[PDB]
Amino acid sequence: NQIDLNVTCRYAGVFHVEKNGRYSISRTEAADLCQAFNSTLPTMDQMKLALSKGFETCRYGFIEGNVVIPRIHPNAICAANHTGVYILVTSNTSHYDTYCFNASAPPEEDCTSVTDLPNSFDGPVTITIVNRDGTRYSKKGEYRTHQEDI
């Protein structure tokens, strides 16, 4: 019973979380997952400010109200060469990665590693936070409050 959570740098408190190396998070799960990091789904304004500080990914993830990819450099295989906060318009499917916003994070680029999952609750899952530099933090618990996400 294991969950891998790959996390990024935080940019103005915003970060990306990919679960189990594939698009696998529902919108309900995403809010619960961010809550475990004492975070919330970013607003579009928080995500735009993160982008301006250097945040970009090549993965769709939830924010409040939409599924987006923040892009700085045009790349043909990331949001069809678009820049800015690219908003997913048409998709058949519901599972993506998520973005989270931690208001207590530093104001600009924070590329230190994540070393805690501070607000997960008691549970049976071994949750491992995987940083881009490979460093890991694991803890037994749960963060999913909706049974349909389990």
Ligand X SMILES: CC(=O)Nc1cccc(F)c1C(=O)O
Q: How far is CA 91 from CA 56, 113, 149, in A?
A: 21, 32, 20
59 has binding-site annotation: yes
Q: Is residue 44 within 8 Å of residue 86, measured between CB atoms?
A: no
> Nearest CA to 46 among 73, 85, 82?
85
Q: Which of 102, 127, 130, 144 binds ligand X (CB under 6 A)?
A: 102
**Per CB under 6 A, 107 contacts ligand X:** no
C-beta closer to ligand X: residue 12 or 79: 12
What part of residues 8-37 is at the interface with ligand X (CB under 6 A)? 10, 15, 37
Per the annotation, does 86 bind a ligand?
yes
How many Å apart are CA 90 and CA 78, to the nearest integer? 15
For residue 127, count CB atoms less than 10 angstroms from its CB and return exposed for 0-12, middle for 13-18, buried for 19 or more: buried
Is there binding between residue 127 and ligand X (CB under 6 A)? no
Which one, 67 or 105, has the nearer CB to ligand X?
105
22 is in an annotated binding site: yes
Chain residues in the site for ligand X (CB under 6 A):
10, 15, 37-38, 102, 104-105, 114, 116, 118
Binding residues for hyaluronan: 22, 59-60, 86
